Amino acid sequence: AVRSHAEAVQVSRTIDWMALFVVFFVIVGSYHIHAMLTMGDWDFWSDWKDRRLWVTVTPIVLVTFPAAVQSYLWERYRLPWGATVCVLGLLLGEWINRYFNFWGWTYFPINFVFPASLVPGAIILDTVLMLSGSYLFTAIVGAMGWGLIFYPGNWPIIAPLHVPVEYNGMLMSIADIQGYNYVRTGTPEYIRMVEKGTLRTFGKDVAPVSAFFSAFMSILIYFMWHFIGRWFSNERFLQST
Amino acid sequence: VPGAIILDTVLMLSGSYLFTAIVGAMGWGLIFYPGNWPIIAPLHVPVEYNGMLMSIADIQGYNYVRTGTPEYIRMVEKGTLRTFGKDVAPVSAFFSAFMSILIYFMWHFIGRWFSNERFLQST
Amino acid sequence: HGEKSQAAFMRMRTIHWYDLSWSKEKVKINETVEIKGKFHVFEGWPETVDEPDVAFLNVGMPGPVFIRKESYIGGQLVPRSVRLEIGKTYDFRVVLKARRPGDWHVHTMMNVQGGGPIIGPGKWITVEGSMSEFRNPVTTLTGQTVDLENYNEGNTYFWHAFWFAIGVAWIGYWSRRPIFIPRLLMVDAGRADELVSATDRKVAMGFLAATILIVVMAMSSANSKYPITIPLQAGTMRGMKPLELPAPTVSVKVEDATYRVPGRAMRMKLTITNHGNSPIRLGEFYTASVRFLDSDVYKDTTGYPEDLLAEDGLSVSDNSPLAPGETRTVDVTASDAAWEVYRLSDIIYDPDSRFAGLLFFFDATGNRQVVQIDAPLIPSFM
Amino acid sequence: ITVEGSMSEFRNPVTTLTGQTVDLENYNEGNTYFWHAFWFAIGVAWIGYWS
Amino acid sequence: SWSKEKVKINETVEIKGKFHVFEGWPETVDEPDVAFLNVGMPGPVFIRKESY
Amino acid sequence: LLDKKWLTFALAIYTVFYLWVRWYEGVYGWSAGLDSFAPEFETYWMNFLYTEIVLEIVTASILWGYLWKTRDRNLAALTPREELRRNFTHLVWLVAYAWAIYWGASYFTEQDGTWHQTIVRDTDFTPSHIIEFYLSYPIYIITGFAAFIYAKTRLPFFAKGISLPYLVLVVGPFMILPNVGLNEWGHTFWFMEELFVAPLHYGFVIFGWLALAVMGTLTQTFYSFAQGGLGQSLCE
Amino acid sequence: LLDKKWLTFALAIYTVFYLWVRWYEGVYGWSAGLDSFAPEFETYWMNFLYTEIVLEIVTASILWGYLWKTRDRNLAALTPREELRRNFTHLVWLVAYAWAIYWGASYFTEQDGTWHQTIVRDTDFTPSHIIEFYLSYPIYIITGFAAFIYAKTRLPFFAKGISLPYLVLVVGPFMILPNVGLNEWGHTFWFMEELFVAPLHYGFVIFGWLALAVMGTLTQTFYSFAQGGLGQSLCE
């Protein structure tokens, strides 16, 4: 067994660090695959960071892993940082690839290929779960906040890129000029799923409407992925594959 | 039959249903086109038919009129700008093998349910 | 560079690039190189390619070794997707500014919404200098000049590092105490209700309130600075002005076209009828970025890429001048190593063995006529 | 449109680019039958071995 | 043009004019392959007798 | 002794090998790696593909066979101290699996995103995919299978049955590799675009979700750790 | 006696009747059966439809009612030998059901495929469908219901409850008949084509899957066979 209380504590600390590494990097891999293949196109390009599709899609598809990891970590250890660890791992993987591949391998500028910020939503999700331990309350209120705070959380970063520029006779934002100048041979302009206007776009409502739709869909996706993570937390054994 | 034989032998050997769903279904998907090539290969001999290039199968479809089956209904390879090199058959075969893994996994449990032996007290 | 992989018939019948020109072959960092030319949208557009209702004038290149300063279709700038009409000819112009040193193969390409990339001829352009000398200045409507290479980079780094630090602080605050096994055992063995106690709830309330307040304050501050912002400018642009080409005075009818398998030559029999009032002579056959030239009739002086240029690759059985009103049938052979290098011979693998191309006819004075030909391409084995 | 004669007299010859003339009525029929019968026999042999 | 500015119940008012479909039709709007000539009004305060 | 310096090697081997791989693809990305029909593409990337596939098959066979042959027959007469040592070794295996999963499913997957967004897709065997689909994915598959086999053959907790969360954690991410068939099919037939969020990529997404079974796997390893040498201290 | 020659009749009646039906549709397929508004179409196919529907309703009523009226009241005092005899009779019923299912769901269904691929669909009541939707499908439905009722009323194993696999095996393939509404709706409103793999046909597919309940049904009949006269020999 273990020699004494002290050796047991040291063993528990070593296990803590190693298991934290395992959880963090398995989450990084899986969450990054999911994110980059469900929101990566918007996350890649400043001229894709629009008010309709980026704001709508990103929180919805990104609340998945935080919900599952929360349903496991909070329930089994009372550790209220499942959402934060998921978001931090995603941001770390994204930034490593942006810096060493998007800017390292190819030479796209960082101010063009920066990722979106998600920590505010993760913090809301985690604190709303720890306080008021109800998973239903989290899925309703915290996921609402996660969806709603996405665009305001990223506005300090992207706002300077939205300064209007008179570019060769046409009006373009700085992000538009970045996308125009830094040629993406594989990514033509029409692939861009961004706000283009509609006849039913009333007033100045594009960003808030998208944010509220994302918050509602985030409630739904959090509810589903809480139970998905519950299943993934099972400890069953099989007698035969 | 070649795919069926692979699926059956890979199950009897290595009794694992998971191993069957992964390896045997892979083989079932992959061996389909090579298994049928000896039959359809003679129908793919090129023919110069009234100024246009046509395979023998194309001429069969043209000649033997299917009133209810016009040519455009044909869901066949027509070429894309992202069709790189000579990859159409192998790419399709590997996609079919992966999807066969998935469908086998689902239908194993579907068959389990259909093999249930329950009784009902009332419809 | 991504061509030689696409289907030969698809490369033959989508878009024909001609009159291509390059302002420079070798440039310094920050120097501009301009690519001009015309492209014709083929009438027999393949059904597997969506019609070019939404098309983007792009540049084929290994990442931003150049930046696209400007691009024009007709005479107007096209930073967005554009609508093209099948059968129309458009003139284009792309201005590139050198950014990264090296030898780069620059293609003019057209991306079509539901068909994928249509890559035109590529030319090797040498860039010399240092990437550190590259500047991309723009002047905003708010009266400030910024360099797009590093503008907003510090702000982006700062905000991302700040939020990452907040998350790491949360995790570390909870990670000071033992993490996994003792907490799991406490939760399992009896009610836990001991690993989360004040001031843990107070710290969480502080974290939540600070997060919301900081987001609100940062948004307000980023609104006071940069008070003038516009959304991303997007949307397909209609009304591209096509070229007003005169009707050709040469009519060509293709009677059978064959290519040997294997081989590097394509043979076709053409019935050419010369209208107008000048003797014509066949000078060029362009099929897919490959120009087969009859050297006795026309010579290329625009610096066309050598691997795509067959100076004497076009042989006409009777290339004597064709008097006006006269109709004659000749055997035309287009032979060059490019036919196999660019895998034009791999049309035997294609499910649609039809070719298309452009014939260029020249009179004595030097003025030229462009006629388009398309026909089934029959392989020959014996 | 009235057709007279016998279906047994019908011929549908085509000449391939490989230099052979075949009748589309029965070309490859024997090969098709052979391969299908062979694979069916293999499957039946498997089942009967277990049966 | 409007035939009348002030009408009685059961009285007819006729609206005439021309419309030009802009060449630079925005891509977010589907092409007017299926279009309906309608009247903007707060419910059936008028009935549409005819439209041409 | 307990936790030894095998963890240092586990981190360092992946780190060094993948840093060298990144250097290799930085040197030969363009210039022998852009034109898939060019002769130097064959000697710098097709040869890489062949060598890496052969070495992966050989290494997987050798490692899995050795782990299965050296399996502990007398698991009943295993002392708690040796059980704790083996639990730490299994945790090192899980650390190696997590590191390999990171390198495969985050780094080289998004790296292939950038590559395919900046160049024209030229083949099914581009330099980026050679490194992602056929090197990093097989490497993490081998590591995960090895960790599963080690748990099953040395840990009595993971013996006497196949752990469902471990099986999911090991096989789901493996299914991403045959899913490449959907990727190639969905890039050549479906979606003449380079949209990274296209439904042709949802095969990676769905089977990337199965890595969430690491949660059940890790609570199982925690219970295996806390069998005889659970303390005391812990809950005392 | 045990298994008697009712099995021969069970095979032969379906074989002979359907061979005659095939001869009839070969003779009157074209030439009174191509034009649905022609007068001879009414006397050769609409009359066929009317007669077959009336006869199917009458036969179903008579057969099911007789089987239910002659149901065994004193199932407790049934000897194992008579139970074995009744199990063999039920197996003959299942053989007849399998034969009818073959004829309905394979022969005439693909035969309707060929017909609808070679001619222009002219009505909802074409000769092919008259034989497939309204003859072969009702025939196998009647046979399946009769087999289910016989099991429930003569076999103590299948009494005292409704067997779920048997109910699925009997009712699912029945649901293919009301599914014809989707077929006609999906051919006239959806899909102006003759694609046999069109989603308008997935109603037949889904309810054709329910015939897989024959596996549970057959293990139930095996257990019913092996109740008292299970052996010995079997496992001895």
Ligand SMILES: CCCCCCCCCCCC(=O)OC[C@H](COP(=O)(O)OCC[N+](C)(C)C)OC(=O)CCCCCCCCCCC
């Ligand atoms: C503290 C208690 C009192 C306040 C309560 C909130 C009332 C609304 C405030 C509007 C402020 C504003 O700015 O208007 C809204 C702005 C537009 O503004 P505008 O362009 O100036 O339009 C001027 C013309 N109007 C006056 C007619 C607007 O965007 C929007 O359309 C946002 C639309 C969001 C739709 C989805 C909401 C889902 C809610 C879910 C709840 C669980």
Ligand SMILES: CCCCCCCCCCCC(=O)OC[C@H](COP(=O)(O)OCC[N+](C)(C)C)OC(=O)CCCCCCCCCCC
């Ligand atoms: C626990 C939950 C915390 C939520 C914190 C919310 C911070 C407030 C942000 C102000 C929004 C704004 O200022 O206006 C809306 C702007 C969009 O502006 P734009 O179209 O980009 O215009 C560009 C010009 N700018 C720079 C001036 C904007 O941002 C958004 O679309 C996000 C809208 C979400 C706000 C919903 C809050 C309603 C209360 C929630 C009730 C249940």
Ligand SMILES: CCCCCCCCCCCC(=O)OC[C@H](COP(=O)(O)OCC[N+](C)(C)C)OC(=O)CCCCCCCCCCC
């Ligand atoms: C359970 C639900 C509780 C509701 C609580 C609402 C508190 C609002 C706090 C102030 C937000 C603000 O002022 O900002 C809202 C911004 C305004 O955006 P803007 O005008 O485009 O630009 C920015 C202009 N500023 C800088 C002056 C703000 O975004 C929106 O358009 C969203 C407004 C619609 C909200 C609909 C909520 C319906 C609730 C129904 C309850 C029965």
Ligand SMILES: CCCCCCCCCCCC(=O)OC[C@H](COP(=O)(O)OCC[N+](C)(C)C)OC(=O)CCCCCCCCCCC
């Ligand atoms: C024994 C160990 C070593 C060998 C291992 C295999 C390496 C690849 C061999 C290629 C042979 C060949 O023929 O190439 C492949 C041929 C094309 O060939 P081509 O037209 O000549 O193109 C010449 C130009 N290249 C050299 C750039 C190719 O089709 C294909 O694109 C097939 C693509 C399949 C995609 C889906 C695969 C999913 C795998 C799932 C795994 C679980």
Ligand SMILES: CCCCCCCCCCCC(=O)OC[C@H](COP(=O)(O)OCC[N+](C)(C)C)OC(=O)CCCCCCCCCCC
């Ligand atoms: C247990 C599993 C058993 C699998 C047996 C496979 C038999 C090999 C067939 C050779 C294929 C061929 O020869 O090339 C590919 C051809 C396609 O050619 P085509 O485009 O029609 O060209 C027409 C001209 N022909 C006639 C010359 C072809 O066939 C296929 O697309 C099927 C590809 C599947 C092969 C995958 C095998 C890879 C190993 C599996 C690893 C996990």
Ligand SMILES: CCCCCCCCCCCC(=O)OC[C@H](COP(=O)(O)OCC[N+](C)(C)C)OC(=O)CCCCCCCCCCC
């Ligand atoms: C889970 C089991 C995984 C199995 C697969 C492993 C793949 C290994 C790489 C394949 C290389 C190939 O195939 O290419 C062979 C290359 C081709 O380069 P070259 O033209 O000779 O140029 C000169 C060589 N440079 C460009 C590398 C300088 O040359 C070689 O011989 C060298 C390959 C060295 C690989 C071993 C070092 C790895 C980093 C150190 C920490 C481990």
Ligand SMILES: CCCCCCCCCCCC(=O)OC[C@H](COP(=O)(O)OCC[N+](C)(C)C)OC(=O)CCCCCCCCCCC
């Ligand atoms: C778990 C995975 C194990 C992999 C084992 C692979 C063994 C290959 C056996 C030879 C097949 C052959 O030679 O045939 C493959 C044929 C070639 O087709 P072709 O060039 O069009 O024409 C026919 C030309 N012949 C007649 C010369 C063959 O089909 C293909 O294109 C498929 C090739 C891509 C396979 C990708 C596998 C990736 C594995 C990754 C492992 C980490």
Ligand SMILES: CCCCCCCCCCCC(=O)OC[C@H](COP(=O)(O)OCC[N+](C)(C)C)OC(=O)CCCCCCCCCCC
């Ligand atoms: C599960 C319960 C199923 C119930 C439905 C059964 C349908 C029976 C057929 C309907 C016929 C109809 O409706 O047509 C009536 C037909 C119309 O042909 P005709 O113009 O008189 O030409 C002359 C008749 N020939 C063309 C048949 C030669 O004539 C008849 O009287 C003859 C019908 C004979 C049916 C009985 C023989 C069946 C094969 C022997 C093994 C059983």
Ligand SMILES: CCCCCCCCCC(=O)OC[C@H](COP(=O)(O)OCC[N+](C)(C)C)OC(=O)CCCCCCCCC
């Ligand atoms: C009818 C729906 C209206 C909203 C109520 C939903 C909350 C239900 C959550 C629940 O089931 O109870 C969990 C805890 C129990 O803690 P208690 O020991 O009851 O603490 C009571 C003292 N307190 C007011 C400071 C909380 O109690 C809490 O969850 C926190 C209660 C305080 C409300 C505000 C917390 C949420 C902050 C965003």
Ligand SMILES: CCCCCCCCCC(=O)OC[C@H](COP(=O)(O)OCC[N+](C)(C)C)OC(=O)CCCCCCCCC
């Ligand atoms: C993409 C969808 C996510 C996959 C999750 C599905 C898991 C389904 C559960 C399962 O696999 O059941 C196992 C049974 C075999 O049972 P046994 O081997 O008898 O185990 C006894 C205990 N048990 C019955 C509770 C399992 O059924 C079997 O026949 C064995 C098959 C086991 C395969 C599960 C591995 C899944 C890896 C992808």
Ligand SMILES: CCCCCCCCCC(=O)OC[C@H](COP(=O)(O)OCC[N+](C)(C)C)OC(=O)CCCCCCCCC
């Ligand atoms: C980690 C994953 C790597 C692949 C291994 C998956 C196979 C697992 C299947 C399984 O659960 O075990 C079932 C049988 C058990 O039979 P055993 O009695 O263990 O036979 C051992 C002797 N043998 C090597 C000839 C088999 O053993 C077998 O299934 C057969 C084992 C031999 C491997 C090759 C069989 C497959 C042929 C295509």
Ligand SMILES: CCCCCCCCCC(=O)OC[C@H](COP(=O)(O)OCC[N+](C)(C)C)OC(=O)CCCCCCCCC
């Ligand atoms: C297309 C989808 C495939 C169909 C498979 C679905 C089968 C669902 C299972 C089911 O039917 O449950 C029966 C219960 C009635 O229960 P009871 O009649 O009380 O039987 C007692 C034992 N039992 C509760 C386990 C059944 O629920 C009921 O109320 C009776 C309804 C039974 C209908 C099942 C027949 C399905 C034929 C299509």
Ligand SMILES: CCCCCC(=O)OC[C@H](COP(=O)(O)OCC[N+](C)(C)C)OC(=O)CCCCC
């Ligand atoms: C946790 C993942 C770390 C990924 C770092 C990476 O990709 O490094 C490659 C990149 C390459 O850029 P650079 O350092 O300038 O060296 C260029 C060499 N090539 C072109 C071969 C990559 O930078 C380094 O090598 C820094 C070493 C970090 C050690 C953890």
Ligand SMILES: CCCCCC(=O)OC[C@H](COP(=O)(O)OCC[N+](C)(C)C)OC(=O)CCCCC
């Ligand atoms: C879980 C959500 C899945 C939604 C699928 C989707 O977005 O598909 C878009 C695509 C519409 O094609 P589009 O985006 O216009 O593709 C343009 C590029 N091409 C024409 C080359 C495919 O629709 C389909 O072809 C059917 C997808 C079936 C999913 C199981």
Ligand SMILES: CCCCCC(=O)OC[C@H](COP(=O)(O)OCC[N+](C)(C)C)OC(=O)CCCCC
């Ligand atoms: C296991 C299903 C057997 C189906 C056989 C069939 O459809 O037979 C009709 C067909 C009709 O062709 P043929 O024999 O030439 O006689 C033509 C008569 N009509 C046109 C009425 C079908 O051939 C026979 O009658 C052969 C007898 C096989 C007995 C199992």
Ligand SMILES: CCCCCC(=O)OC[C@H](COP(=O)(O)OCC[N+](C)(C)C)OC(=O)CCCCC
């Ligand atoms: C389980 C897969 C179901 C996929 C459905 C499908 O393939 O539908 C094709 C069809 C596309 O129509 P299309 O194939 O172009 O039909 C051409 C012929 N017309 C225009 C007469 C219908 O889409 C729809 O109309 C929606 C189908 C809903 C399924 C629940």
